[PDB]
Amino acid sequence: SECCELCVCQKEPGTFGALIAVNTITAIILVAAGAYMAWKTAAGLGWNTRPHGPEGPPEENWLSPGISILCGVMYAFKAIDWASYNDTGESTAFSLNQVWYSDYLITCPLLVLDFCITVNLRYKLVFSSSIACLLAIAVSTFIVDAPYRYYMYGIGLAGFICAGYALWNEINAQREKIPDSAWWYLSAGRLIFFAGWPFFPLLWTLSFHTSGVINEEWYFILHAILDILCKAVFGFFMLGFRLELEELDFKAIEAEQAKLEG
Amino acid sequence: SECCELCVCQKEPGTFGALIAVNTITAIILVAAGAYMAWKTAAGLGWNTRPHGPEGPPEENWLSPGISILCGVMYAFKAIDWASYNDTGESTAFSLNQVWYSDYLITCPLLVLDFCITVNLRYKLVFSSSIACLLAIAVSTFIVDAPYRYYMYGIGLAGFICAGYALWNEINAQREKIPDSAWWYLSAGRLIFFAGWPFFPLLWTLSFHTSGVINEEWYFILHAILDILCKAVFGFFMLGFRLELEELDFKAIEAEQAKLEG
Amino acid sequence: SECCELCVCQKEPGTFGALIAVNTITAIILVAAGAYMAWKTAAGLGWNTRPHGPEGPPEENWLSPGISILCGVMYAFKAIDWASYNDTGESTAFSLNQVWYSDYLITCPLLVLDFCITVNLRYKLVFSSSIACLLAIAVSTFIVDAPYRYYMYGIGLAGFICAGYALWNEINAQREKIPDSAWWYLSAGRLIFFAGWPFFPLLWTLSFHTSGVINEEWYFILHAILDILCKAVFGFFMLGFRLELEELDFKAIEAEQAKLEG
Numbered sequence: 050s051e052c053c054e055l056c057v058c059q060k061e062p063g064t065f066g067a068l069i070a071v072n073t074i075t076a077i078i079l080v081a082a083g084a085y086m087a088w089k090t091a092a093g094l095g096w097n098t099r100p101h102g103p104e105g106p107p108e109e110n111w112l113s114p115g116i117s118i119l120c121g122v123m124y125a126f127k128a129i130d131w132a133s134y135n136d137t138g139e140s141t142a143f144s145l146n147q148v149w150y151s152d153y154l155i156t157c158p159l160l161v162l163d164f165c166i167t168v169n170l171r172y173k174l175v176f177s178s179s180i181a182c183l184l185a186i187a188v189s190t191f192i193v194d195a196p197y198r199y200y201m202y203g204i205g206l207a208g209f210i211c212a213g214y215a216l217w218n219e220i221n222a223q224r225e226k227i228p229d230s231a232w233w234y235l236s237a238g239r240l241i242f243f244a245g246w247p248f249f250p251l252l253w254t255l256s257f258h259t260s261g262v263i264n265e266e267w268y269f270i271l272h273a274i275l276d277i278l279c280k281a282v283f284g285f286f287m288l289g290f291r292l293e294l295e296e297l298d299f300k301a302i303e304a305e306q307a308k309l310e311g
Numbered sequence: 312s313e314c315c316e317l318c319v320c321q322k323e324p325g326t327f328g329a330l331i332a333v334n335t336i337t338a339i340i341l342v343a344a345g346a347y348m349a350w351k352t353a354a355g356l357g358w359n360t361r362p363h364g365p366e367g368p369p370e371e372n373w374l375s376p377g378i379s380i381l382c383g384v385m386y387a388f389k390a391i392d393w394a395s396y397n398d399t400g401e402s403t404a405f406s407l408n409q410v411w412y413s414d415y416l417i418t419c420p421l422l423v424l425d426f427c428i429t430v431n432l433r434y435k436l437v438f439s440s441s442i443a444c445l446l447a448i449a450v451s452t453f454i455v456d457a458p459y460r461y462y463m464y465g466i467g468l469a470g471f472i473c474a475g476y477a478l479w480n481e482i483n484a485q486r487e488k489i490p491d492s493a494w495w496y497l498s499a500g501r502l503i504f505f506a507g508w509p510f511f512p513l514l515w516t517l518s519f520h521t522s523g524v525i526n527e528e529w530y531f532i533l534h535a536i537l538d539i540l541c542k543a544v545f546g547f548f549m550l551g552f553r554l555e556l557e558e559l560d561f562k563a564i565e566a567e568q569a570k571l572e573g
Numbered sequence: 574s575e576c577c578e579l580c581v582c583q584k585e586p587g588t589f590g591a592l593i594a595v596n597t598i599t600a601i602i603l604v605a606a607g608a609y610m611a612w613k614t615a616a617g618l619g620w621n622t623r624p625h626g627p628e629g630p631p632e633e634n635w636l637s638p639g640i641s642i643l644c645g646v647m648y649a650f651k652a653i654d655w656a657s658y659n660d661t662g663e664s665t666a667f668s669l670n671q672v673w674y675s676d677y678l679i680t681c682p683l684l685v686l687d688f689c690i691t692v693n694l695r696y697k698l699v700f701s702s703s704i705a706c707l708l709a710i711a712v713s714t715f716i717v718d719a720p721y722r723y724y725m726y727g728i729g730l731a732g733f734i735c736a737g738y739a740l741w742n743e744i745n746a747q748r749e750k751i752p753d754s755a756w757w758y759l760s761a762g763r764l765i766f767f768a769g770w771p772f773f774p775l776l777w778t779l780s781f782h783t784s785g786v787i788n789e790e791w792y793f794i795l796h797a798i799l800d801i802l803c804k805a806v807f808g809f810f811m812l813g814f815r816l817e818l819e820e821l822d823f824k825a826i827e828a829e830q831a832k833l834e835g
């Protein structure tokens with residue numbers, strides 16, 4: 050039928066509790082992580098919350114909490130949607146669970162931008178737009194029928210590997226500048242970027258529409274954990290990196306000022 | 312049926328004259344207001360149209376006329392759409408009247424940005440993106456079915472109140488800088504922002520889909536007046552503010568130059 | 574029926590080879606042109622590929638290759654879509670051939686921006702957003718029914734003529750600055766802009782939905798050539814302009830440095 054054997058549209062009303070629970074929990078996690086990040090950025094500069102200043106926190110210091118909070122709002126909307134599936138058995142009109150990877154568009158162009166701004170990686174906009182385009186091909190690979198979904202997957206994967214290589218090069222060409230104390234958080238966010246991301250593309254090969262190992266319910270459940278790790282946990286490592294840099298900057302400024310007085 | 316009792320889809324062909332008229336009138340108003348604003352910005356700097364310069368009017372001086380003109384084009388498209396409802400009785404393919412608050416997305420992210428640029432309010436992009444996201448929840452609250460539209464409304468209203476509080480704080484933390492002559496126009500645009508906006512959210516509670524006091528025809532008619540007051544009249548007050556600032560700046564420059572010669 | 578007499582939906586499975594071929598060829602052309610442009614921008618500054626520097630190529634030097642490559646990816650997706658029409662006889666779920674001029678949105682706001690950045694034309698964002706809005710009216714004129722498609726066409730054409738006039742003025746008010754060596758490429762990209770663009774609007778008058786001279790198959794075939802000329806060939810002239818400017822800049826810097834040493 051319209052709903053494939055392994056879809057959430059074949060599940061009966063009353064059997065969606067797991068999905069609502071997972072999505073509410075992830076909404077809370079993402080929103081609260083983003084709220085901690087927001088508090089940390091507002092409260093102060095470095096690890097010891099040094100008073101910001103007249104201009105306040107930079108506007109890019111809000112990109113990171115921003116994504117986490119927005120993804121949490123998205124997940125709350127998804128859980129509201131899943132609750133309609135539990136009752137009415139037929140979703141909402143505004144369902145963020147209908148189009149797969151449609152929310153990942155926004156989130157990704159915002160995260161790659163974050164990384165590229167914080168680490169001062171070059172071609173910030175280039176990278177961010179490339180990822181938006183590769184995550185538009187991702188949506189397509191879920192909607193487009195069999196033979197052509199694999200052709201589209203090929204294009205998307207080629208570009209993903211190309212952009213990944215270029216990104217790797219950029220981070221490794223900024224390693225010299227990045228202090229060793231701040232590199233821990235960077236390498237952790239990179240690890241999240243090079244392992245965690247390829248996971249999204251490989252889970253495709255075992256998905257409900259491709260193979261059929263993971264049914265749509267469980268695919269959705271797994272993409273929630275992956276979002277906690279991207280979005281939320283990526284931002285906590287990037288928040289850490291930022292704070293380390295800002296504490297080291299405070300230290301450097303204070304030392305420069307000591308030498309200025311002396 | 313698909314069309315609720317109090318909808319424009321239940322109205323017979325030939326009974327849409329009022330809607331076409333209102334929407335054409337508002338199109339004219341918004342476009343002409345934006346054109347006056349455009350002329351004023353191009354012609355000169357302050358109230359006495361002081362010759363601009365080599366670079367010309369700043370690109371942000373076009374955000375304000377821009378929105379008004381675009382909303383007027385939107386309303387012209389809406390009136391064309393309403394004319395098809397008057398004749399064919401079944402709308403156009405490209406109807407800006409189908410999805411409610413879908414046009415408000417663009418207009419709002421552009422207006423909050425305007426305010427934040429002109430008054431130099433901090434977190435410009437943050438505020439603008441927050442409003443875009445809260446006006447995406449607004450569209451949802453019109454499409455999503457009963458129980459879940461109120462859950463979504465709750466999220467939207469929470470964020471609206473949060474962003475409103477934050478905005479209020481920002482404007483009041485910039486009051487010291489803003490000259491008293493320019494504050495008149497600011498307080499008027501703020502009044503339009505804190506009263507006029509909450510009106511949009513309260514009319515929801517009495518709308519065709521929520522309660523049923525205001526049928527979709529009249530809801531549409533009221534949202535046209537509200538757009539004249541937001542968009543058009545908001546920009547005339549903001550244009551006024553800008554011009555006041557620019558005239559005071561011209562005065563300050565001329566005084567500084569007199570002291571430079573002396 | 575839903576498909577008009579002169580549409581690609583009336584063509585039988587197996588008769589789409591021409592469309593696939595044209596769209597694959599254009600995909601290759603656009604991608605390869607954009608890749609040459611990308612190589613040229615990365616490799617060096619001017620015509621003689623002068624080593625760039627620490628910061629590398631400006632982020633706007635990627636807007637031009639970018640569009641060409643993205644339009645090539647779009648056309649590859651279109652050819653994949655056309656192959657489904659050749660086999661299944663009913664398109665893909667993600668068809669870039671469904672909505673007419675929907676891809677032109679992105680491409681156009683990116684190209685006008687390019688021109689305005691490279692030639693330092695004023696009102697860059699204004700122009701780019703105007704074109705995005707006029708190319709949203711373009712999509713409408715393909716979907717909206719008879720009487721109202723001509724009303725929308727009128728609005729779109731009025732704005733197109735207005736924006737065209739304003740653009741002409743801007744380029745002619747920057748002619749004095751632009752060196753004569755670089756003007757060749759500029760006038761060629763302008764020629765592509767003032768002739769080539771009006772072609773898009775005039776082909777509308779003879780299209781499958783308006784008149785019926787050009788059926789949708791051949792309209793699609795012609796819009797592919799027009800994209801090679803816009804996108805691809807526009808960027809090769811703009812790449813040329815950029816390179817000329819950069820070689821002249823290198824020359825000027827080297828002369829200034831000779832005088833600095835002397």
Ligand SMILES: *C/C=C(C)/C=C/C=C(C)/C=C/C1=C(C)CCCC1(C)C
Nearest residue numbers: 153183187205206209249250253279
């Ligand atoms: C926070 C959101 C994330 C990390 C989403 C990432 C999405 C991708 C890395 C998409 C990957 C792809 C697919 C699974 C579909 C098409 C092929 C790829 C590789 C672009």
Ligand SMILES: *C/C=C(C)/C=C/C=C(C)/C=C/C1=C(C)CCCC1(C)C
Nearest residue numbers: 415445449467468471511512515541
């Ligand atoms: C110029 C356009 C304007 C002023 C539109 C504003 C729209 C809102 C303030 C939306 C308000 C909300 C709803 C009516 C729906 C969801 C809840 C709110 C408060 C976000």
Ligand SMILES: *C/C=C(C)/C=C/C=C(C)/C=C/C1=C(C)CCCC1(C)C
Nearest residue numbers: 677707711729730733773774777803
């Ligand atoms: C690279 C993409 C290009 C050059 C697309 C350009 C599209 C236009 C110039 C659209 C023109 C118009 C229509 C054919 C429909 C509505 C009326 C116009 C003039 C805006």
Ligand SMILES: [K+]
Nearest residue numbers: 089090093094
């Ligand atoms: K901070």
Ligand SMILES: [K+]
Nearest residue numbers: 109163166167
């Ligand atoms: K950042």
Ligand SMILES: [K+]
Nearest residue numbers: 120123152156
């Ligand atoms: K998300």
Ligand SMILES: [K+]
Nearest residue numbers: 146148149150
């Ligand atoms: K989804």
Ligand SMILES: [K+]
Nearest residue numbers: 113117280284
């Ligand atoms: K994050």
Ligand SMILES: [K+]
Nearest residue numbers: 351352355356
């Ligand atoms: K002005």
Ligand SMILES: [K+]
Nearest residue numbers: 371425428429
């Ligand atoms: K402004």
Ligand SMILES: [K+]
Nearest residue numbers: 382385414418
């Ligand atoms: K509007």
Ligand SMILES: [K+]
Nearest residue numbers: 408410411412
């Ligand atoms: K509407």
Ligand SMILES: [K+]
Nearest residue numbers: 375379542546
């Ligand atoms: K306005």
Ligand SMILES: [K+]
Nearest residue numbers: 613614617618
């Ligand atoms: K270059």
Ligand SMILES: [K+]
Nearest residue numbers: 633687690691
């Ligand atoms: K450029």
Ligand SMILES: [K+]
Nearest residue numbers: 644647676680
């Ligand atoms: K294209």
